[PDB]
Write an enzyme that holds these catalytic residues in place. Sequence first.
Site, short mmCIF file in Angstrom:
data_model
loop_
_atom_site.label_atom_id
_atom_site.label_comp_id
_atom_site.label_asym_id
_atom_site.label_seq_id
_atom_site.Cartn_x
_atom_site.Cartn_y
_atom_site.Cartn_z
N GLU A 150 -36.03 -57.72 -56.01
CA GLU A 150 -35.71 -56.47 -55.34
C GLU A 150 -34.47 -55.85 -55.97
O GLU A 150 -33.64 -56.56 -56.51
CB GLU A 150 -35.55 -56.80 -53.87
CG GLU A 150 -36.90 -57.10 -53.27
CD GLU A 150 -37.43 -55.89 -52.53
OE1 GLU A 150 -38.14 -55.06 -53.15
OE2 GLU A 150 -37.11 -55.78 -51.31
N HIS A 207 -8.54 -58.87 -37.13
CA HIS A 207 -7.83 -58.22 -36.04
C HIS A 207 -6.38 -58.64 -36.01
O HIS A 207 -5.58 -58.01 -35.33
CB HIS A 207 -8.45 -58.69 -34.75
CG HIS A 207 -8.46 -57.70 -33.65
ND1 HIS A 207 -9.20 -56.54 -33.70
CD2 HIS A 207 -7.89 -57.75 -32.43
CE1 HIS A 207 -9.06 -55.89 -32.56
NE2 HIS A 207 -8.28 -56.63 -31.75
N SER A 217 -7.13 -53.12 -39.56
CA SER A 217 -7.67 -52.41 -40.70
C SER A 217 -6.56 -52.01 -41.66
O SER A 217 -5.50 -51.56 -41.23
CB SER A 217 -8.35 -51.17 -40.25
OG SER A 217 -9.41 -51.47 -39.37
N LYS A 240 -16.25 -40.26 -34.91
CA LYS A 240 -16.35 -40.15 -36.36
C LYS A 240 -17.50 -41.01 -36.90
O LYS A 240 -18.13 -40.63 -37.88
CB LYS A 240 -15.03 -40.47 -37.06
CG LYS A 240 -14.97 -40.08 -38.54
CD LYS A 240 -13.61 -40.32 -39.15
CE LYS A 240 -13.55 -39.83 -40.58
NZ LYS A 240 -12.19 -39.91 -41.16
N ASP A 241 -17.77 -42.16 -36.27
CA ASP A 241 -18.87 -43.04 -36.64
C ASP A 241 -20.22 -42.36 -36.37
O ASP A 241 -21.16 -42.58 -37.13
CB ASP A 241 -18.75 -44.46 -36.05
CG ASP A 241 -17.67 -45.34 -36.69
OD1 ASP A 241 -17.27 -45.10 -37.89
OD2 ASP A 241 -17.17 -46.27 -35.97
#
Lengths: 85, 244, 244, 56, 383, 383
Positions: free
Chosen positions: E272, E202, E206, E228-229
Site C-alpha cells: 500500500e 500533558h 503542547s 478550530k478543530d
Amino acid sequence: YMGWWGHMGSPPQKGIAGYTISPFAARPFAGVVHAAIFNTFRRTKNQALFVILPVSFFYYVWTQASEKNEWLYTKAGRHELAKAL
Amino acid sequence: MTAAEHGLHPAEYPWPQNGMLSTFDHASLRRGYQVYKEVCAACHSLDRIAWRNLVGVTHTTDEAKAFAEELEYDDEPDDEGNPRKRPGKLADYIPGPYPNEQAARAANQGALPPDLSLIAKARHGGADYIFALLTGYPDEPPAGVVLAPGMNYNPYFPGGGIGMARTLFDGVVEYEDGTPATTSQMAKDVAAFLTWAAEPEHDERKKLGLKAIIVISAMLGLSVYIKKFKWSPIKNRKFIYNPP
Amino acid sequence: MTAAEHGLHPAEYPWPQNGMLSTFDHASLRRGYQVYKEVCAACHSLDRIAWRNLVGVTHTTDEAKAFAEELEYDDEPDDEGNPRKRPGKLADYIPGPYPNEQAARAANQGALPPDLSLIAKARHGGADYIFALLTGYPDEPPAGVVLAPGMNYNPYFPGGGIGMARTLFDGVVEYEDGTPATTSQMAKDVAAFLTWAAEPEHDERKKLGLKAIIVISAMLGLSVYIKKFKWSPIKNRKFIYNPP
Amino acid sequence: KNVIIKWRGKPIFIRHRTSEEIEEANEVNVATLRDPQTDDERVQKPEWLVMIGVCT
Amino acid sequence: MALRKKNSLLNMANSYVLDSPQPSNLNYFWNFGSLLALCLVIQLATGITLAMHYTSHASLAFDSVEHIMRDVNFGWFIRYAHANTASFFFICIYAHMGRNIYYGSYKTPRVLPWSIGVIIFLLLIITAFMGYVLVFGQMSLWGATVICNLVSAIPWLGEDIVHFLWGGFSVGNPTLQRFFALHYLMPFVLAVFALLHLIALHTAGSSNPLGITSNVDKLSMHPYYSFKDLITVFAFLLMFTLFVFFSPDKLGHPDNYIPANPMVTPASIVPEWYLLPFYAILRAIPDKLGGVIAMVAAILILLILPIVDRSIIRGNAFKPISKLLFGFFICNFLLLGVLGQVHIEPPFIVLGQICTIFYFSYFLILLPMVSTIENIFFYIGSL
Amino acid sequence: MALRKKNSLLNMANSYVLDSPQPSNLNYFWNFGSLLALCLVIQLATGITLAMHYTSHASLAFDSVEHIMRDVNFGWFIRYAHANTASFFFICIYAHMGRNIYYGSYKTPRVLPWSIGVIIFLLLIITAFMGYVLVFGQMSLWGATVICNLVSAIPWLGEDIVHFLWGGFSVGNPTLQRFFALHYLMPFVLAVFALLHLIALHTAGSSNPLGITSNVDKLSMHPYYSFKDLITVFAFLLMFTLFVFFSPDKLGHPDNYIPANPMVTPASIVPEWYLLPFYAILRAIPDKLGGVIAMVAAILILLILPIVDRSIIRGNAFKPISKLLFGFFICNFLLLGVLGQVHIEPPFIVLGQICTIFYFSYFLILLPMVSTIENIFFYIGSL
Ligand code: HEC
Ligand code: HEC
Ligand code: HEM
Ligand code: HEM
Ligand code: HEM
Ligand code: HEM
Ligand SMILES: CCCCCCCCCCC1=C(C)C(=O)C(OC)=C(OC)C1=O
C-alpha cells in the site's frame, strides 16, 4: 514544566495591560479582503523558496530517471540497457 | 518494462456514467446484458449476480422471473434422499457455462476465462479497458510478433497474446430495442453492463455523495464563521506595556 | 415430570478412565472400534474422526492406512474436468453410511441415527448412558406401555420409546484378541471407544493436570509462608498509648 | 397429517385436516379462548391449516 | 467548587478537553492530532461493523467482502469508508510527524510523548498490514507472503518463526484467521498508546510554532481549539466524501479484486502506498537481512532525533538552513515513496540507493552539522 | 524525588499498585477484586486465541469449535479454560458484590464506584450471553431465541427491534456473526468500566471490614496486598485446574454438543447457571413485559441501596439483625437460582413467586425497617 490555572509557571507578570472586545461587539470578518490578498501574498512570498527549491530539484531528478528508464526499454535503448544490466 | 509487457493504455472514452452527477444509461445496461447473455456467457460466468439484481435496473420483476424459471437448479434431496432439480427463483445466481476450472480450461485451449462480475474493477482501465480490448483486435498482428499456440494478438492485453479470440462482429446480436448492433455498439453496451455488475451501488452512491458534498460544504462555511466569531477576542487583543 | 419422561438414570459403572490418574484402557478402545465398525457403522456416522486419529491410540500407522486405502474418496476433477475417485489417506475422515439426513431417516423408519463422535459428551451420563442404553432393552415392555410404530422400549431413553432396536447380541462380533464378545463386553468396549471419540485429549489432559496440581499446590504452600513472613511486622505490632 | 416447512428459519405446520377435524375445531365457543378466534378467521381454506409452528 | 473540577472522573475529562491550558498561537498543523483521533474513531466504528458481516475463513473471506459490497445495506459505504480512512490515517500521521519534526516537538521536555509516538506509528503499520490481508485478494495473499518471508532473514530461527506466524507452510486459512483476530485487537492497543502519549505530553503541554514557552499566555482548549478543530474536521470530511462517494477505488490496487491464487503470481507485488518509502529503503540494501534491518532502522532512527538535534532553539521557524534541509528531507521521503513502486530496473536501482543514503544521513550527519553551525550563527550574528 | 513519583506515567501505576494507601485490616473477601482482574486477563488471552481459530459463519461455527478441541495444539485447554473461567468470573463477581453489600461498600462516599459496578455487572451478563451463542449448539441457538424474544415485549417497536437485532426473521448466520463481533468488543468496554470504578474508588480509598476510617492507619498496597493476593490467586488456580483438567464439562450443558437445529426444540431451555436467579424472577411474573421489567429491575434495584440503607453505621460487622437479614437474602438468591432450572410445575411455581417477593422486599421494606430500628437500638442500648 507546566502548572495549572493560577500557577501556570510563568515568571511574574507585571506592567502589561491587555484589552479586547466581545465577539458580539466585533466584526469577525473585519479586514478579511486585505488579509486574504495582501497578508497571504506576504506570507507566501516569504516561504516560497523553501518549497520551490527542494520540490523543483526532486522533480527534475525524477523526470530524468523516468525518462531514461522509458528510453532504455525501447528498441533504441537496447544496447544501453544491455550494458546497464 | 517494455510497453508491450505493459499493454497499450486504453483511451479515455466519454462514458455516460463519467461525471460526478451522472448515472449509468439503463437502456445501455439492458442491451449490455443481452450481449453478455448471447456472446460472453458461452465462456464466462457472472457468478456474483443474482436474478433479483436485474430487477428495477435492466428488467421488470416478471422478465427476471422468466429468465430464472427457464433454468434448473439443485434442490434439497427428496424424501428418499435422492437428488432433485427445481426451476430457478429470483434469489438464484446466474449459472456459469462450466462445472469447474478444469472443464473451463479444456474448452479454451488451456486458458481460463475469468468470471466477469468484478472484471471492471479488477483491471486498470475499467470500462475503457473492456471496450478497448474487445474492439482492439487488429486484422493482422504487427510484423515480427510470434504468437504462442492458441493466442490472438491484442495490444491492450499485457504481453500482447491473449487466449480469447475476437467475438464481437457486426450483427452477432439482434438488439430488442432496434439499436444497430455494430462491434463498437456492442462493446460499449457490454462494457457498461459489466461496470454496473462490478459496482451496482454506483448510482445511489453518487447521489448520496451529492447530498454529502452540499451539507458538508455548508457546514464548512458555517464552521469558518463560528470559529472566527469565537476567536475574535483573542485575535483583536491589544497590549500596553509600562515597564515596572 | 414423570420419571418415564426423564428416562431411568444409568448406574455409575467403574470405568477404567474414572479416576483422576487413570487413562483409557487402549485394548478396550481397539475392541470398541471393532464394534463400531461391524455393528454401529451400518447406521451411525463418526464424522469427526479421521484415520490419523486412530494411529497410536488403537492402531499402528500401517493398520490405519490399510483401513483408509480400502475406501474411495472424491478426488479433484481430472483434466477434462470429469469427477474422479481416489483411495483414502490418513487425513481422510471416516465416511458415514448415508449421503444425507433424508436417506438416513428413510432407512430407519423416520428416525435419524445421530453421529456418534460427540454422543458421549452430548448426553447426560456419558459412557454410563451409552452402556445402560445398549444393554437395557427388556425382552418385553412393562405392561401398559403403548409404543409408537417403529419404536422399541428402552427405559434409559427419555419417554421410553426409542427408534433404535437392540443390536448387540452375544457373538455378533468376533474380537481379534480372543475376548468373549458378550452383549455386556461389547457394550463396555464401544462405550469406551465412543468416550474416547468425544474427548481424545482425555489421557494427556489428566496427566498435565497432575503436573498442574502438584506445582500449583507447592506454590500455594510457599505463597502462604511468604505472605506470613512479609506480614509478620504488621501482625506483631504493639502500641503504648499515653494520652496527651 | 401435519407437515413442517422451514420458512425464514421458523417451522411452518401445514396440516391436511379431515372433515371431522374441522368439525372438532368449530365446536369450542369463541367466548372461552385466551385469544378469541374461530377457524374461519385463521384459515382461508378449511382443509389447509397453515401456521407458524413456534409456540406463542 | 465546580462539579467538573470536584468529581475525579469529570476532572480527568476536564483536564484534557475543556480547561486544558493550550498555547494561544497553535497553527493549523496542530489539528492533525484531532484528525488522527477522528480516523481512529471512524476505523473503530466501521471496522467493528465490517466484523459483523465478514467471515475470516479463507474459503469465504473474499466472498464475504463481496457480500458486504452487494447485499448489506450501506455495506459499500462502510467498506469504502474503512478502506479509504486507512489511507487518510496515514496522510494525517505523516503530517502529524512532519509537524513534530519541523517544530522540534521531539526535544526535551517532550522526548517521552515522541518516543511513544514512534511506537504508535509501528502499531499503525502492523494494524494496516494485517487488515489488508483480510480481503484475501491477490495483493492480500502475495503481499502477506513477501512481507512475512522477510522474517526468514532472522538468523537461525527465522524460518521456524515464519512457519509459526503462518500456522502452516504458506499463507493460508490459519494465517487469515489469526490476522483477523489480531487486526481486531491492534486498534485497541493503538488507542491505549495514543492515550499514553497524550498523558505523557500533558506534563509539558503542547509546544507551539514559535518554540518558546506558552506558560506566559494560555487559552482553554474549549471553546477555542474545539471550534478550530471543527474546521479541519469538515475539510477532512469533504476529502473523505470525494473519495468514498465519487472515486472509492482510486487509492487501491485492481489486483485485490481478483481472489487470492497461490499459483498465479501478480505482475507486480507492491505494498500500500503508505508503506512504499520503507519498501524502497529495503530494496536499496542488497542483503536480505541488511535490507530488513535498514527498513526497521528507518523507523527506529526517529528515536535519536532528541540527541542528534544539537540546537539551542526548539523548532525550525527561525532557522533558514534547517528549513531548507527539512524541505530536502521531506521531498526525498516522497521520492523514496515513488521509487518503492517502480520496477527494479535501471536507473531506479542506483537512485533508490542514493535516496536511502540521504534519508539516513539526515539523522546522522546533516542535522547534527547544521544544528551546530546554526547555534554559532545565532550567537555571532546577534552580537 | 523517586522516579516512580516524578514520571507521570509511572506515577499513575505507582498510585494504584505500589504506594496506594490501603486499610491495614482488609480480610480475604477483599481479594475478589484481583481475582476478577485475573479472570478478565485469562478471558482476554484465551478469547483472543480462540478468535484466531474460530469461524463465525453459521455453517462452520460449531465445527470450528470441534476443530479447536481436536486439531489445534492445546486447543482443548484454551477452550475449556475460556468456558470454565466464564463461570469462575461469575463466582468471583457474586462474591465481590456480596462483600460490597455486607460491608456497606455502596454507602457514601462510595456511591459512584458502586453505581459503575452495577453497569460492569450488566456488561458481564451481555458479554457472557453473546459468547455462549457462539458455539452454535442447541443451547446456544435456543437460548439466543428465547432471550432475544424478550425484547419483543417492548411496546409498539419490540418486534421490529428483535428483527433488527437478529438481522433477519430468526436467529441465524447474521445473528451469529454480529454476536461474534460484539462478544469480541464487550470485554474491552468492560475493562474500561472496571478501570473507571477503581479510579472513582480512589477518591475515598477502599472501605474495610470495620466500616470505620482507615485514614488513621494505612499500609502500602505493595508488598502487603500483592503477596496476600498471591494466596488467592493460587487457590483460584487450584480450583481452575480441577475443573479444566479433571472435570472440564461439569458446569456445562450436554445439549450444547448437539449442533443447532431450528426445527427440534431441546427438552428444557435453561440459561447458564449464573443467570438462573434472574430467570426465576422473570418466570414469577405472569405478564411478558411485567416479567422483563422485573428481571431488569432485579439488577437495577442495586442502585437504590445507598438510599434505602438508613443506617448511621457502615456495614454489617456489628449489626446482628442486619447480618441475619443478609443471610436470608443470600440464601433466597440461591433458592431463586435453583428454581430457575426446575420445571414450571407445582409447587415450584408459587415458591418462585414468594422468593421473588422476598428478593424485592429486602430492598424496599426490610432493609429500610431493620436499618432504622438498629439505629435506635445502638443509641438507646449504649446510653
Ligand atoms: C469462446 C470464448 C470466449 C468468448 C465468447 C468470450 N471470451 Fe472473454 N476470455 C476468454 C478466455 C479464454 C480468456 C482468458 C484469456 C487469457 O487469459 O489469455 C478471456 C478473457 C477476458 C477478459 C480478461 C482479459 C484480462 O485482462 O485478463 C475480459 C475482460 C473478457 N474476456 C471479456 C469478454 C467479453 C466482454 C466477452 C463477450 C461479449 C467475452 N469475453 C467473450 C474466452 C472468451
Ligand atoms: C440399524 C440401526 C441402528 C444400529 C445398528 C445402531 N443404531 Fe444407534 N440409533 C439408531 C436410530 C434410528 C437412533 C435414533 C433413535 C431415536 O432417536 O429414536 C439411534 C440412536 C442412538 C443413540 C442416541 C440415543 C439418544 O439418546 O438420542 C446412541 C448413543 C446410539 N444410537 C448408539 C449405537 C451404538 C453404540 C450402536 C451399535 C454398537 C448402535 N447405536 C447401533 C439406529 C441404529
Ligand atoms: C493514532 C495516532 C495519534 C493520535 C490520535 C495522536 C494525537 C495527538 C493529539 C490530539 C495531540 C495533541 C494535539 C496536537 O499536537 O496535534 C498530539 C500531540 C503529539 N503527538 Fe500525536 N497522535 C498520534 C500519533 C503520533 C505519532 C505517530 C507521533 C510521533 C511519531 C506523535 C507524537 C506526538 C507529539 C510529539 C505530540 C506533541 C506535539 C506538540 O504539541 O508539540 N503522535 N497527538
Ligand atoms: C487503526 C484502525 C484500523 C486500520 C488502519 C484498519 C485498516 C484496514 C485496512 C487497510 C483494511 C483493508 C481494507 C480493504 O482494502 O478492503 C481493513 C480491513 C478490515 N478491517 Fe480494519 N483497520 C482498522 C481498524 C479495524 C477494527 C477496529 C476492526 C474491528 C474488527 C477492523 C476490521 C476490519 C475488517 C473486518 C476488515 C476486512 C473487510 C474489508 O476489507 O473491508 N478494522 N482494515
Ligand atoms: C469477560 C470476558 C469474557 C467472557 C465472560 C466470555 C465468555 C464466553 C463464553 C461463556 C463463551 C462460551 C464458551 C463455550 O461454552 O464454549 C465464550 C466463547 C467465546 N469467546 Fe468469550 N468471553 C470473554 C472474552 C472473550 C474475548 C475477549 C474474546 C476475544 C475474541 C472471546 C472470544 C470468544 C470466542 C471466539 C468464543 C467461541 C469459541 C468457544 O466457544 O470457545 N471471548 N466466551
Ligand atoms: C470486572 C469486574 C470487576 C473487577 C475487575 C473489579 C475490581 C475491583 C478491585 C481490584 C477493587 C479494589 C479491591 C477490592 O475491594 O476487591 C474493587 C473494589 C470495588 N468494586 Fe469492583 N470489580 C469488578 C466488578 C464490580 C462490580 C460488579 C461491582 C458492583 C456491583 C463492584 C463494586 C466495587 C466496589 C463498591 C468496590 C469498593 C469496595 C471496597 O473496597 O469497599 N465491582 N473492584
Ligand atoms: C483514544 C485516544 C485518542 C487521543 C486523542 C483524543 C483527543 C481529541 C483531540 C483533542 C486535542 C487535544 C487533546 C490537544 O491537546 C490539542 O491541543 C494541542 C488539540 O488541538 C489543537 C486537540 O485537538
